[model samples]
Target: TNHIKEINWEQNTNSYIQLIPNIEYTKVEDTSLTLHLLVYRNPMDALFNRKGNQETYPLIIYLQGCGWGWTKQDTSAFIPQLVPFVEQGYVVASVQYRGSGEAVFPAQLHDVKTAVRFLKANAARYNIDPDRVGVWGDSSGGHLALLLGLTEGIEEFEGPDEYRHVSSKVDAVADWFGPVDLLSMSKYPSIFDHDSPNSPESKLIGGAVQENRVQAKQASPISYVHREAPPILIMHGDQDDVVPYQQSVQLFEALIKEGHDALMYKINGAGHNGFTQAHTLDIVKSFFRKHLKPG
Candidate 1:
C-alpha cells in the first residue's frame, strides 16, 4: 500500500498534527511570489500555561522537494516528518516558492529567504525564537536548505520591506538526498542519463551544461561550503538511482575539509526516499534534538 496515498488530512490524529493554526497564504512583492505560513502552538500547553511565561519555540522552515518545478501545496507529505519536531516543542513553517520553470535559480532562493525574513521579523508576534531558526528540505529543497544555512547572514537578495536586512541564515540545516555539486555530477555516470551534465542541473541552473557552465557552478551548494556554515545533518541512500551517492560523499568530504560540523547517514539498500525508514527517522530526530533543540 502507498503510505503517502493513504494519508488523510481531514482527520485530527495524534501522530499527524497540524502545526500552524489559521494558516494563511499571501503574495508579496512585485514578482507575484506566494508565501505560506503555518503557526503551530505547543501541543502540551497545559504544562506551562503561565501568563507572560510563554516559552519560545524553535522555528523550522521546511522546503518541499519538487526538482525545482513541482508544487507541494499539500502539507500531508511533510506532516509526518515535521509533527515530531513540533511535539518536541518547536514551530514548523512549510514554505512554497516559484518553481524552476516558473522562475529561475535565485528566484526560489529569494522567495524562501523572504519567508524566513518575514518569520524573523515577526518572531515576537509569533512567540518564536528567532535565533533558533533552522531549515529542512528534501532533494531540491535540500539544496535550498543548505543554501539557507550557508548564506544565512549574507544579504545578496532583494525582497519586500526591511526584512531584507534580516538575515536569511539558519542556525542548522537538515538535508535529505539533495544534489550539491553541478559541475562534478558528470563523474557519476551510473545515476544520471545525461552525457555531459545532469538533466536537473541543466534545467535548474539555466541552460545546457556546456553552454551555462558558470551559472551551473554557481548553483551548487558545495561551492559555498565554509567554516561559518551551520551544523548540517545529511541522510542519503547509497542505492539512490536519481541522485548518486557520491554527491553526498563529496559534500561530506568538503564540509570535513572546511572543519565544519557535518554528519552523513548512509542507509544501505535504500533509495532516494530513504528518510521514510523508521530507523532513519529516529536518527534524524535525535540529530535535530542534539543540534537545534533549545536550552
Candidate 2:
C-alpha cells in the first residue's frame, strides 16, 4: 500500500468547458482577429470523429451581432449563455473581425475565413474536427456566417495569406436575423433607411447599397447561393425592425430554388433581439447536431 502514487484528485471531474481567450488568428494593419475558444474537457481515459480514430469534437465558429461595428462592445455578455453548446460536447469559438469602420464587405468575409483556417490549422491542439466546422451568428454576424457557408473556394473572400493553405469551407450555417439581400433591404419599411449613405449596409460596402448596386450584390449572401451550399438554417423574427424579416425570406427562397438543404423559421413576436431565446438555441443545437455530430 505504501507504493501508491497521488490519485490526481484535481483531474477527476465529470466535464467542463475550458475557456481559452484572446487567441490571435490574423492581424490587419493595427487590428487583429482574436478568438475565444470554449472547449469541453474530456479526460484522456474517456472514449470518442472524421478519420474516426481519436477523440475530436465538432467546432462551432460563433460570431456576435455588432451591427457591422455600429456597437462598441465585445459581445462577451452573451457568451456565457452559449456554454450550453460546450456542455453538449462541442467546441465553440467566438471570433473577432474587422468592422465597417475598419474594412468593407469582402474584408470581413476574408477575416472570418482566416479565422476558420487558423482553427483548422490548430485543430489537433484544440481537439477539434476540422471537417465538421459550422458557423452560427446573429444579425451582422449572421450575414458573415452566411457568407462563410455560401462562398467557399471563391478567391476574393479568401483574404490575405494567413493560413492560406487550409480550406475555409464550413459544413453548416445558422443565420439569425441577418441581412441577406442588401439591395432589397430598403424596399420594406424599417426603423432606419437602408438606402441612406451612412447606413450600416452602406458603411459595409463603402457606398450606399442602392448606389453601389454591384457591390451590394457582391456582398449579398443570396448572390452566392448554389446547389453546393452547405445545409443552412435561417431564423428571423417576424417583428425584426433592423434587418427586415423578408431579408431571410429572400435568402431562403434563393437557397431552396437551388435545391439546397435549408430551413427557415419565422419566430412570432420575436425581434432582432429575440434570437437568443431558449427555443431558438434548441433549434440551432438540433440543426448543428444533425449536420456536425457523428451519427
Candidate 3:
C-alpha cells in the first residue's frame, strides 16, 4: 500500500454503432480549393443542417488522425464520435486539413487554425457558441489540437487566411495518442524510422527530423506550452508503437510544470489509435463540459 501505479483499461470493447434518436450531416466544401469540415448538430439550428430551435450549442472540432500523410476524409470516419456529442447538445465538426502529400509542415496547422477561425466567423449561422470551443484529435490530429491550443496567440503559425481577427483560441483540448516530438520518432521501439528522410515526420517537415531539428521542434506541441494555454486532457496507449506513450506524458508534464491545467488517461496495453475505452468518450465529454459547456 506504500506504492501505487495506475492503468487505463479499455472502456467499450464493442465497435458497433449505437444509434442516437436522430442525427444529420452537412459537408462544407471549400470553394477556395482548401480544406473542408463535416458538421453534425442537433436540436437543429435548422439551417446549418437540421430542424428547429433558436438554441445554440457548444462547438467541438474533431481532427482525424492521418500521421501527417494525406488521407481522404469523410464524415463516416467520425460518425461514432458525433453520435455521442450531437445527441448531448453539441455541434461537432470534423476538420479535413491539408496532408503532408498535399502540403508541408505548417500547412496542416494552417488549415486547421484557419478552419477554426472560419467556424468562429460563422458561429452564429452554425449555431455554435464562438466563445466555447474545444478540439479533439488522435495521433497527428492530436498534435494539431495541441498546436492549435498552445499557439493561440503566436503569429507565425497564423496563416494568411480570411477572418484573421477572429480568435482561434480553444477552451479545452483532448489529445489521443498524438506524437509530441518528431525528433524522438526514430528512437528505440517506434515504428517510425524518423532518422530516414522518408519517414512520415520527415515527409511532413521536408527532411529527416534529425537533419531538420528546427522544423521538427517548430512542429512539436510540447514546445508551445504556457500558463494561459487551455486545460488539456491527454490519453495514450502505453503499449503504443506508432506514436509512443511518452509523447503524451511529456506534454502533460510540460503543461503541469508551466502551472497550466492538465489531465491524463493511459490506455493499458493498447496500441496506436487504441483509444476505444468505454470511458474515452465520457472522459472527453466531461472535460469539454467542464470547460466549454454553458451554465
Candidate 4:
C-alpha cells in the first residue's frame, strides 16, 4: 500500500528595501535638487491590500554631512544607516541641498525646507504621513536639520519655492555633532582653523567666521533656539575635534534654557562619526519613536 502526503497552500511573505532614486524635490536655479528614498516593504497586506485599505508611515529625512561644501559622500553612502529606520516602518528620504560651492547661508536651509514641503505636498503618493516628519543629520547637515526644526514659521529661511503653502516644519530633530556657534569654533580645541575663510562654516556663510560675525550668527542654529522649537535630541562624541563636543553642549544648554524638549548624549571616547555605535543608534530610534509615534 502507498500513502500520499497532503500539501498545504499559504501566502508567501517577503521583505525588501525599495530604492526610489533621484526624486526631483525642487529645481534650484538651473540644477534639479533631488532626494533619494528607502521604502521598506513588509507586512505586504498593509501596503498592497487593495480593498478600501490605505497605509501610511512616518517620514525620516536624513541630511548627509559634506563639510558644508567640500562634498564628501552623498546619501547613497547613508543607505546602510537609514535602512534601520525604514525597517522600523518609517519612510526615509535623504535630501540634497545647494552646497557652499553653489550658494551660501540660507540657500542650503531654503533648499532643505523646500524639499520638506515637496515631500509633504506629495505625501500621499510616497505613503508618508505629512504631519509626522523627523529630520537628522551629521556635521553641517545636522546644523541644517536643527535649523529646520528651530526655524519653523520663520520667513527668512523659507525660500520662494513651488511648495510654499506646504509647511516645512518637522515634528522632531536629531543633531549629530553639528556646529552650533560658528564664531566660537576657532576658540574650541580643534584641528581646523574655523575662523579662516577656508573653514566649512565660513564657506557656508560666504566669509570668514570671525570677519562676518553677523552672517555667522545668522547661520548658527543656536541663534534660533526658542521654547516653541520641536523636540530635539543632540548626540555628539566627547572627543570630536572637528565640531568639538562643546558645540553640542552649547546647543543642549540653549535648548533647555528655552524650555524646549531636548536631550543630549555624549559618547565617551568616540570621534566625529559614530553612526555605527549601536547604543547611540538605539537612543536615536527611541527618540524618534517617542516623538513621532510611528506605527
TM-score of every model versus the real structure: 0.81, 0.90, 0.82, 0.91
Model 3, span 1-295: residue lDDT tens: 8978988877423222222321222122442323233334332233466343445678888888877773554424765656567656677777777668777879888777887888888878666788889998888888999888888887778776478879988989999988788876656488766668877788888888898789998988877785378888999888888787887888888888999889999888788764655677788878888998743
Ranking by TM-score: 4, 2, 3, 1
The Cα error of candidate 4 at residue 71, in Å, is 2.6
Write the residue-wise lDDT of candidate 1 on 111-141 in tens digits. 7888888888888866678888888888888
Per-candidate clashes come to: 3, 0, 3, 0
lDDT of 1: 0.72
Better of 2 and 3 by TM-score: 2
Kindly indicate the candidate among 1 and 4 with the higher lDDT: 4
Flag the better candidate by TM-score, 1 or 3: 3
**Best prediction by TM-score:** 4
Tens digits of lDDT, candidate 4, 5-115: 899766543246678889998886698888998875444545787432246889999998898777743868887888888878899999888889888989999989998
Off by over 4 Å in 1: 1-18, 21-53, 70-76, 158-162, 189-198
Q: Candidate 2, which ten residues in sequence have the lowest lDDT sum?
A: 44-53
